[model samples]
Every structure is written in C-alpha cells, then in structure tokens.
Target chain A: TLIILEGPDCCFKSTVAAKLSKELKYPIIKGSSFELAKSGNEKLFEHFNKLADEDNVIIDRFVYSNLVYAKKFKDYSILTERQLRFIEDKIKAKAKVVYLHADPSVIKKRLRVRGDEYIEGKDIDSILELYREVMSNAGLHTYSWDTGQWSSDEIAKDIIFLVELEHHHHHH
Target chain B: TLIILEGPDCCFKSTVAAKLSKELKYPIIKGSSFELAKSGNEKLFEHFNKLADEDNVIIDRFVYSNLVYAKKFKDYSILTERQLRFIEDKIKAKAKVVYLHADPSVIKKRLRVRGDEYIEGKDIDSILELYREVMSNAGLHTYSWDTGQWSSDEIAKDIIFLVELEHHHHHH
Candidate 1:
C-alpha cells in the first residue's frame, strides 16, 4: 500500500516516519526528499507502480501537502488541477494521507526549538488551512491525526494498527 | 543592487534575466533554480548576502515570491515572517523589484509551446494576485513591468535603463 504521512513542517514528520519505519519495517521515504518542480509534482507517476508492489511504503510528505500549501498562495499554486488528475490516474492503490498536525502554539514552539527559520508564529494557520483544503478535497484520500498530546511511539503504533485495518478495508 | 525579476511561468523571466545579465554584466539567479521547501521558501537566506558585495545580483525568485505563494493558503505559510526579516536584514542593499508580467493568454501560449504540464488551462488572475500581495506587503520594495507585445531584448534594455535610474536615485 502507498501510505503517506502529510502535514506541516516542524511537526516531527521525519521523526514520526522514522519511528513508524522502525516498527512497521517499511522503507520510510521522506516526501520532502523528492525533488519537486515548481508545481510540486514529483516524477512519481511511473515510479508509484513499482512502489505499490512492495510489501508496504511509508512517505513523510506527498502531493496533498504540496497541493494544500500551493493553494494557500495567490500568485500561483504549485500544483494545478491538471497535475492532480494526472497523478490520480497513475496510482493503482488508494493513498492514506495521514494528516499530522498540532496546535498553533505547539507548532510554533516546536519550530522555535528546532530553529527552523522557514516557519514563524503566524504561519501555523496558513499551513493548517492548506491541510484543511487537502482533506476536504473529494478527489483525495485523507485522514486527520493530531500530534498535540501524543508521543512518537504512541502515534506510530496507532498508525501501524490503522494501516493494518486499512489493508482489510481495501480487501473487502 | 539585488534585482529580482518576478513573474508567472513563461513570462520571459529566464530570457529577460539571461539577456539582462549578459548585457548589464550582472549575475543571473533564477529564484526557481533553488530547491524550495514545501513549494515555498528557498535556501537563499545566508546566500543572499554573498551576492550583495558583487557589482550587482540578479535573482529570478526570492522571499517575496515565497510570501506571495504562502499567502495563497491558510494553516501555515511556507516561509515565516522571521525568515523574511532574516533575509531582509542581511541584504545590505535596496532591491530593484522588476515586477515583469504579461497577459494570461500570452503566458499560456508560451507555456503551451514549452509544454509546461503543470499550469494547463488555469486562470492567471490568481498568480497575479500573489504578486499583488507581495507588492502590497509593507516590508518589500517592488515595481511592475509589462512584457506584452515586447520581445526579450526590448524588455532587457528597459530594465537596464531602470537600474541605472535606480542607482542615481539612491546616489542623489
């Protein structure tokens, strides 16, 4: 299955994905690692097929996050509707978008601690709005998960079980 | 001087930047050339300072574009206010905002010729609005240019003249 953990930055996406990989034994690929073009679409249309045939796959971020973030800006969105449909047609499996998030204050604190200069206090809502729009998109497969009160282990464990359930959900 | 030529895709940004750079003997930097994080900020924070000491700097995209694109969404922006301020302070020179642009139809035609897959059949107004926000932001210095019915050489020559004017404006 193609399982993607999509969310705002500094919300421990890489950290959680690492923990999940340890427990699940799936190759954890940080979605941020991919070289996305200006439109936020990676060269995964053909690559996704090989990816799905594997036992399981874990990605830190995915198209939805890019879609969400891009939709927030006015000048130009990173990914367009045409790009979205193109990706959808290629993916043979259903994507589980684990939308990881935290409260604005909590996110700010985390970003501050990490010294990720790319993020700031007021930007929390902007990132959240991006995620919200992605989740609400009927064309996508997304679920929300709050990391505000959970540890990495707890969150990863819960997601492991959820993916198992997802397997069964797809089977029937 | 840091001259940023901001515009939508296929608006002759590259042609103008390269032509302007060759003629004016300024370094041409495609802001799009940098690897952006989450379709937003580039890793040019510390790097912006390096180019300032040169005769002049030419960049295709910058923090203003990040801010413009970020404003397109809600939950969080890509680049934070802190990063924006960080870049601004390190930039020891006034920026010459070469806000170059064209009609959506013109842009779409160019994109079609180039076969830019991401921006197919979309409204150009949204992209223009992003630039509008960047221009409206109180912290930035920007100006507009029209590439409609204008060739690359014509546009480049005009910007060269404008830069000379800018230097004298600052000097006087």
Candidate 2:
C-alpha cells in the first residue's frame, strides 16, 4: 500500500509520520517538493514508484501536492490529465491514497513557530487558502485528520489502525 | 524591463548574463528555479513587481519554465492557473521575456561534462523534450540563441543590443 501524507510546509507531517512509523513498525519513506523541483519529473516519479513497489510506503507529500502547487500558476490541463491517468493506473494496480487535513489557522501558527527561512515573511492566509483549495480538488478517498486538535502520536495511531483495517480487507 | 535567459541547466545562462551586464554597464539581477520554487505567489509577485518598478532585471528562469517542468503532472490545474495569471499580469506590468535555446545533443554533452550531482543520471533526450515544450508554449516575444553554435560573447552582444533597443523604444 502506498500511503501519501500531504499538507503545506509547516504542517507537522514529519512528526506525525515518524510517530506512525514507530507505532506501526513500518519503514517511512520521506519525500519533499525540493527533491521533485530540483530533479524534475522522472526522478520524482521513480522515487514514488520504487518505494511503493516495496513494503508499505509512506510519502511525506507526493505528486498531488506538487500538482496543487504548480496548478496555482500554470495551465495544468495537460499535467492534470496525465496525473489522473497515473493515479487511476495506480489505484487499479491496488495502491491506496491518504490525505491529512488541518485548520489554516493552526498551519499558520505552526509555520510561524517552525521559522523555516524559505517561508519567512510569507502570509499564512495564502498558504491556508492554497491548502484548502488543494484538499478540495484532490480527488482521492482521503483519510482527513484534524492535526490542530490531535497529538502527533494520536494521529499516527489512528492512521495505523486505518491502514491495518484496509490491509486486512485487501488480503481477504 | 526584465530579460529572462531560460534553457536546460548548464546552458550557460549565468555566464552569458554576466558578460551582457558588463558590456551594457547595467546592473543585472539573476534568478533561478531554485529561488522561485520556494517563494510563494505573493512574495514572488512582490519581488518581480519591485524589480520592474526599479530597474531592468535578468532572470535565469521564469514562470514558463516553472509551469513546463513543475506543473506537468496530474492534479496541477489550480496551481497552473494561478501561475498563468501571475505570468500574464507580470508581462502586462512590464516584464520583457527572453528565451535561450540550445541543441539537445549539445546540452547533453554539456551536462555530461558538468556532471552536476543533481543531473548526473538524467537523459539528454528528456532535457531536450522539456526544452522544446517550454519554448513552444511560452507566451512572450522570445529570442532564441543557438548556444551550441554561438559564443557566449556573441550571444551577450545580441542580448545587450536588444535591451538597448527596447530602452530606446520605451523612451520614445
């Protein structure tokens, strides 16, 4: 199963993924936009496909986020068509999709606290708005989590349980 | 006015831009995808607007390349649209776009020699494919330079002449 955890930059995806890895004893594979942006499409897709082919893979922000962010500027009709094809192929091939959701206010606060130089002086509202738009448009059976209220560990536990249930069904 | 030199990596944009700046005796501001990808829409727009308000800027790459490369995936519609708006608005707000083109075989040779860690394993065909797509789709009065055939100084001279011509027209 390919599990992708996607959200804006400062959303505690790493923390939550780490906790999930520890709890579930599953190896977590981390990926970022920096890797995709610098290396381009082939590398990005290869990374996802390789890990996914192995054990259950946990992607910290996958192609969906990249699409959402890129669509914010370009005419994504071509790309969107390609991605939908890719996702549908993956689903037919039995890959699972997961999504994490959090309040924009909470995400903004987290960004302010994280103090990543790249995001300094960027408006939280804009990030939140983009995130909301992405979430709404990402056509996937997403398992949404309100990270604003839950601890990272708690979120991880819930996700692990969901994955286990899904896995059990897949085998049957 | 902003003159953007865009092509695959290691296509000699920086070297050519430096030469042009020296010959023209104009301050040159250079930027890359690395810088822009991290910047949110508002910050990027603000920076580009400020530069337009002040003096001529030479960008290494712009929204076109960003779209062609980053947004060429499924699910990038929204981000792509936003970027198109930004590019259109910026062009209307006075950014003169310049494109640099190089032969794929030549670029492949350059990348092979440069052997940048990021692009070490990338195929030349892939780079050529992307370069062609970006150039064809870019909505601007683009000047193409055959970097494979032309010397950097020669290319620089042509660009400087164009810049002066644009300046003269602006004054008139």
Candidate 3:
C-alpha cells in the first residue's frame, strides 16, 4: 500500500507523515521540490510504482503537490488534464492520497515561526486553495485533515483506523 | 534542432560535442549518468522537448546512452521497447542523433591516459555492441562517426556540413 501525504507548505505534512510512518510501521520517501519539479511526473510516478510493490510505504509528497505548487508558484501546470486522469486511474487501486491542510491563518503563523527563506507566508491562502482544488477533484482514494484543528497524533490515529478498516474489507 | 552526441566511455563524445558546439554556435547540455539513471526518461525527454524548440542546440549525451549503459552495466534496461519507440517518434522530426565511437584498441589507449576510476575500460567491447544495437535501430535522423578513423576537427566539419545541408532542405 502506498500512503502519500500531500499538502501546502507549513501544513504539518512532515509532522503528520512522520506520525503515520511510525504508526503504520512503514518506510517514508520524501522528494525535494526541485527534483520533483524537474524530474517530471512520469518519472516520479514510475519510482512510486517500485515502492508500491512493498506492503506499506509513506510518501511525504507526491505528484498532486507538483500540480498544485507548480501551477500556483511556477505559473504553469505540470500535467495535462488527460495525463493527470490517466495517472490517477493507474494508481487508484494501490495508493491512498492523504491531503493535509491547515487554515490559511494557521499556516501563516507556522510559516512565520519557521521563517523559511524560500516559502512565502503571503502565498498561504492561494496555496491552500490550490491544494483543495486539485485534491478534491482527483479520482483517488483520498483523505483530508485540517491539521490546524487537531494534533498530529489525532490525525494519525484516524488515518490508521481507516487504513485498517479498508484492509478488513479486502480480506473477504 | 537538437543534436545529441552519444557513445560509450573515452569515445570522444565530449571533445566532438564541444567542437560541434563551438563550430555550430550552439550551447551544450551534458547530463550526469547518475541524474539520467535516477530521473528516468520521461523527465529527460520533456527537458529535450524544451531544447528542441530552439533552432540549434547540442546535447553531449542523451537517452540512448542511458539505455545502452544501464542495460550493459546495471544488468537492466531503463526504457521498454514501446516507451523507447514513443520517444523516438516524438523527437524524430526535431532532433538528430550523432553516435561517436572509437575502435576498442583506441578507446583502451585513451582510457589508460585518463584513468577514470569509475568507468571500466574492460567493458568497452560489450558497451560498443550495445551502442550499435540501440542506435542502429532508433529510426531517427542518425549519423555515426568512427573517431578512431578521423580527428575531432574532421568529424566536426562533416557534422556541420550535414546540419547546414538539412537546413537548406527545410527552406525549399
């Protein structure tokens, strides 16, 4: 099973993905934005296919984040609509997309606290909206959490619960 | 037009590409094998597509080398036959492939001169055969030069002549 954690910056994706990784006893794969952006979606997804062969794995960021962030910040969408749907159809059986988001005000506070040189706190609102727009429409087994409203532990518990619940359904 | 220079180790790709880059007045883009192997073909070709928009450009090593080296040394192929055909079709119109090679004895002498620790001089024969198999069947506008038979200057002149000849064909 491939559990992909994707979201806007400062939305606690790392914290929550780490939480899920530990709880699910799964190895985590995290890719850099530069590598993800430059490597293109097909390559990135091909790598994911290898990981999907394992029983359980967690990815800190995956292709959805590429479309959301590149479209918003780079001023261009990385994948065409047809290409995006084709990929979604390919991975839907073995992967679950978990989009971790926070209120823009909450994201702004976190970004200011971290004082990251590259991530702009001002873009939180648009980034959050893009994540919602893309993730909501993506035809995959998807879950979302407003990380601002709950602790990482709480969100992780719920995620594992659903994962376990889904596993039971597959057992006949 | 995208002019890609490809071959095995110590085959004068860099020298020939540099000479061609200078004579043709085109920028050279050479990618590391590590990047080529790890990033996969779709990303690499998407990048080549951007370069293909230009009227003239030189790539020191491109996708064919990746398949030949990975299949021979890594004991696996990087691209499927169908995927390889798809890419070749996409770029055939906008690109020309130049395979630079030297006889094994000549390459052995150059390898001894440079003494690169990582590139195995012993593997030259198998590598040469792999290059021949892949490039001969690629079905694109391809040119081959035996650097063993000619100096880099001589090969560069021949390459430029054909490139200018092709440009004239596009005019009428």
**Candidate number with greatest TM-score:** 1
Backbone clashes in each candidate structure, one number apiece? 21, 18, 1
Chain A (alone) TM-scores for all candidate structures: 0.76, 0.73, 0.81
Worst window of 10 by summed lDDT in candidate 2 chain A: A71-80
* DockQ versus reference, model 1: 0.13
Q: Which prediction has more favorable TM-score, 1 or 2? A: 1
lDDT of 3 at B62: 69
Q: Write down the RMSD of all candidates, one decimal each.
A: 14.4, 11.2, 15.6
Chain B vs. true chain B: TM-score per candidate: 0.75, 0.73, 0.82
lDDT pick, better of 1 and 3 = 3
Candidate ranking (DockQ, best to worst)? 1, 2, 3
Contacts from the true interface found in each model, as a fraction, amount to 0.29, 0.04, 0.00
The interface root-mean-square deviation of each model, in the order shown, is 12.5, 10.8, 19.0
Clashing pairs in 3: B1-B55
Residue B20 lDDT in candidate 3: 82
* Cα lDDT of model 3 by residue, A51-149, tens digit: 445547888776677676565322223666776676666667667788888888887777556433223344567767777888877878688888888
lDDT against the true structure, per candidate, is 0.62, 0.58, 0.68
For every prediction, compared with the true complex, DockQ reads 0.13, 0.05, 0.01
**Cα lDDT for residue A91, candidate 1:** 49
- Deviation (Å) of A135 in candidate 2: 3.4
In the range A65-86, model 2's lDDT, one tens digit per residue, is 6655554433221134465556
